[PDB]
Amino acid sequence: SHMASRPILIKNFAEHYRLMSADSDFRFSEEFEELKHVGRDQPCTFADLPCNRPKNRFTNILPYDHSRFKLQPVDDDEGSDYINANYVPGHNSPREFIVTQGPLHSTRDDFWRMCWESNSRAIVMLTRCFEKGREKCDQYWPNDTVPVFYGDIKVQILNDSHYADWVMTEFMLCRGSEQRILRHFHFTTWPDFGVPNPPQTLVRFVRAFRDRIGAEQRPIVVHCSAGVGRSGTFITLDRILQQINTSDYVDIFGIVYAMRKERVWMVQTEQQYICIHQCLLAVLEGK
Numbered sequence: 687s688h689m690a691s692r693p694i695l696i697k698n699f700a701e702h703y704r705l706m707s708a709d710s711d712f713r714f715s716e717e718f719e720e721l722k723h724v725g726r727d728q729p730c731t732f733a734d735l736p737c738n739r740p741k742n743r744f745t746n747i748l749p750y751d752h753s754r755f756k757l758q759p760v761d762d763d764e765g766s767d768y769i770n771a772n773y774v775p776g777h778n779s780p781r782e783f784i785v786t787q788g789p790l791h792s793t794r795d796d797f798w799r800m801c802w803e804s805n806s807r808a809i810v811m812l813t814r815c816f817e818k819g820r821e822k823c824d825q826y827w828p829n830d831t832v833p834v835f836y837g838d839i840k841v842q843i844l845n846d847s848h849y850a851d852w853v854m855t856e857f858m859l860c861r862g863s864e865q866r867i868l869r870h871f872h873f874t875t876w877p878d879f880g881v882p883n884p885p886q887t888l889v890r891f892v893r894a895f896r897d898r899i900g901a902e903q904r905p906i907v908v909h910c911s912a913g914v915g916r917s918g919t920f921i922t923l924d925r926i927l928q929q930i931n932t933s934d935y936v937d938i939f940g941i942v943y944a945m946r947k948e949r950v951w952m953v954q955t956e957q958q959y960i961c962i963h964q965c966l967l968a969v970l971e972g973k
Contacts, residue, residue, distance in 0.1 A: 691940035692717065696930060696970065703967050711960060717939060718956040724946035725750060737765035741796070743787045747912045753948045755784050757799055769796045770913065772949035773905070777925040784905045785921065785949055787913040788813055788823025795837040797826055801868065801907055802839050802861055808899050809907040811872040812916040818878045822911040827857065827870065838862075851875035851887045852894065871895050876916060881961040886973060889965045892924050915954030918945060922953060922962050927969065938962055 687693075694702045706714045732738060733748035742748055749755075753772035760766035769786065770793075776782025784804055788811075789797040801809065813822045828834040833842035840860040844867065847854040855870035873891050875882065882888045899906070910916040922941045929936055942959070945952035953959050 690943040691937055693935045693937045693940060696934045696936055699936060699970055700967060703963055706963065707960070711956070714960055714963075715956055718959045721939075721942055721946055721953075724943055725948070725950070728752065728947075732765070732768055733770065735765050735768075738768040741768060741790075741793055742770055743790060744912050747787065747914060747950055749949060755786070755800055755804065757796060758803055769793065769800055771800060774908075774921060774945050774948045774952065776906070776921060777928040778901065779903075781905065782902075783908050783921055785908040785913050785917045785952075788909050788911050789826045791824045791826075794824055794826035798836040798839040798841065802859060802866075804907070805904045806907045807866070807868055807904055808895075808902065809868065809870045809909070810895065810920060811870065811909055812876065812920055813910040814874060814876070823909070827855070833858075849894075850890075852891050854894075854898070869898065871898075873920075881919070881957050884968075885961055885965045886968055888920070888923065888961075889927075889969060889973075892920065892927060892965075896924060896928065912954075913949070914951040915958055918942070918952035918954060919958040919962055921945065923965050926962070926966055930966075930969070936966065938966070 728750040730748040731751050732754065733742060749770055749772045755769060755771040755773060756767045757769055771784050771786030773781040774783045774785045784800065784806065786797065815821065815823050815825050826836065827841060828843055831843050833840055838861055842858045844856040844858050846856065852871060852873045855872065857868045857870060859866045859868050875887055877883060908917045908921060922938060925941055926936050926938060942953045953962065
């Protein structure tokens with residue numbers, strides 16, 4: 687098709703890349719520029735209520751109404767159903783990911799409740815808590831093995847595995863007499879400015895994640911700072927790598943356009959838009 691899908695025939699992806707990157711990413715920069723309006727017209731009524739105003743890390747990153755995850759309502763709290771997060775499509779399901787902002791201390795309770803209510807068995811954290819001096823995301827998980835209660839959810843570290851660019855963490859999650867495990871994928875290498883360089887690091891992580899998570903059927907929670915740029919770059923990359931195993935086509939454009947329609951600025955910057963292409967380019971060319 688043509689309008690919300692620019693599919694490439696894999697056997698030519700390496701040329702398409704050249705052709706796209708050529709002239710200071712002329713074509714690339716231009717292809718991206720088409721998405722700059724996708725889904726922005728959609729209402730954000732709830733996110734925009736007074737009682738939910740303090741819950742948003744950024745005033746111009748708010749979940750569209752049709753896509754937002756909703757927390758079980760609480761009978762005295764007005765607007766208690768709210769959290770900054772949308773179901774965003776993945777390779778295997780329309781409601782495969784829940785991408786959200788990095789919780790504030792003011793929202794980590796809500797954030798945990800979402801994981802529990804969503805039945806999500808995997809969080810993917812793509813930002814550092816602090817970076818270059820700002821705070822991006824509140825430490826919403828214990829930093830030792832003493833179990834910590836976030837609301838009604840008791841989170842405890844069963845073990846963690848540090849690597850070069852990310853740390854795996856296995857949480858036990860308890861609500862009442864009910865127990866589950868959750869795997870926490872924390873990519874800790876992303877550069878203070880720009881996209882990961884070399885991008886291979888990100889591919890490496892996505893492989894580690896997917897290999898580890900399998901053909902998951904409940905939601906995966908994905909987050910960064912605002913829940914748009916990196917979150918969008920990961921999900922897309924995860925999708926396409928799964929994809930090149932069942933098709934001789936890839937639709938990075940198509941993937942983004944679909945995500946935009948679901949949650950704001952999903953692949954945020956054309957550097958990330960390019961980065962996705964480089965990662966795949968790297969894979970198709972045997973690193």
